[PDB]
Symmetry: C2
Subunit: 112 residues, 2 copies
């Protein structure tokens, strides 16, 4: 990807939030989990989903802080209307590892 | 922020890398070198991260960085990437991280 300005980075609104609900998404083509993430009092609770069943479980995900893009338009993923892209990386086997914060931070803080 | 497209997000190139060197930057900051793997290589950065971190606690840590800004001089120091983080409840910087080890140079998506 070509070089960018700070403005073109800053306009992408990435926030940290805490997963408050997680359930399997068996309707999806690939194995996946649906979550609700609390992004703090201003942004509120937002829906997302991800192919994160290899390393994570609905039971263990609740309470984890994740990073998400919060300013996309909603995305219909089969029957599920997602509001946020939950961010991660492929590991050495291609399985998804979640982005995180090194220690707890207020929900709704912007990445910078 | 106002609404953006997937394409707008794709213009931003954020990678995971490993801090391989860290030294204090009196002027409060720390200068780091980050290994972003075989395609990108070693990149320099500096950050006001002295409240929660030291050079000793940094070296070996994986961090996230924007790798596609123009490089900039800070006196003789050539800063090449933005090391990503968040303000804590007191305004002090907490590093973005990965939940478990990932190959250096993988793209955030």
């Amino acid at each position: 990807s070509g070089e960018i300005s700070y403005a073109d980075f800053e306009k992408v609104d990435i926030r940290v939030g805490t997963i408050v609900e997680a359930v399997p998404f068996p309707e999806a083509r690939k194995p996946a989990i649906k979550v609700k993430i609390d992004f703090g009092p201003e942004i509120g609770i937002k829906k997302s989903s991800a192919q994160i069943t290899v390393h994570y479980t609905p039971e263990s995900l609740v309470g984890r802080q994740v990073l998400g893009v919060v300013n996309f338009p909603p995305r219909q993923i089969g029957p599920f209307r997602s509001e946020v892209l939950t961010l991660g990386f492929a590991d050495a086997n291609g399985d998804i590892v979640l982005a995180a914060v090194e220690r707890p931070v207020p929900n709704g803080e912007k990445m910078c």
